[PDB]
Each structure stands twice: as structure tokens, then as C-alpha cells.
Amino acid sequence: GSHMSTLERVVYRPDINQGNYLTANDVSKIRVGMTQQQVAYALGTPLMSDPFGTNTWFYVFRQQPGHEGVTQQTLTLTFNSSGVLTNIDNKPALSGN
């Protein structure tokens, strides 16, 4: 994106170079059946910093080649009325960032 500067990262926490957000590894960590609080802790609370405010969570996939028009794959977590995981919606991202 326009804000290409990836200098901010809070502290030195090496793994991915392409971001400081959630990746595929952590998606593989979670599972349907647990709550919002469970996933928020398993995955890491989203940018808004308040996961328990919404029922639709948006996350990103691990450092991948992006061999298409779209590169990334977004994780959209869907929670029911109770705040329980119903579906892990993993579909393609924007054509960039």
C-alpha cells in the first residue's frame, strides 16, 4: 500500500517480513468450537484491539509467494450470537495491501 514502511513492529519479533499481523501458522492453531476470547488469545487480538466488539474478525496469511493477481489469503472469523466459532472463512485477499 501507500504506507509501505514496515518499520513499526513494536519490538523485534522475527518470523515474517511481510507483516506483523496474524499468519497461516496461527490459523492452523485455532479451531471452530471455541469462543471469541479463545481465538483472540490463540490468534492475537485484531488491530482494533477489541475482538469482543465484533463478530467478524479479519486476519492475514503467512508469507506466501503471491503467484496470482491476488497474493494474500484473508482469514475471516465468523462467530454466532453467543460469541462461539461457527466458521473459519479463509478466502483470497485484496490484490495487494
Solved how? Answer: NMR
CA dist., res. 36 & res. 82, Å (int): 9
* Domain over 19-97 is classified CATH 3.30.1450.10: yes
CA dist., res. 88 & res. 97, Å (int): 21
CB-based contact 90:73 (threshold 8 Å)? yes
> E-strand spans in 1-97?
56-59, 73-79, 85-92
Q: Would you kindly state where each structural domain of the chain is located, as residue ranges?
A: 19-97
User: Left if phi > 0, otherwise alpha if psi is -120 to 50, otherwise beta: which for 95?
Assistant: alpha
Using the CB atoms, write b or e for 49-68: b if 16+ within 10 Å. Answer: eebeeeeebbbbbbeeeeee
> At residue 34, what are phi and psi to the nearest 5 degrees?
-85, 180
Tell me how long the chain is: 97
Kindly compute the dihedral angle of the four CA atoms of residues 11, 14, 19, 25, in this order, to the nearest 10 degrees.
Answer: -130
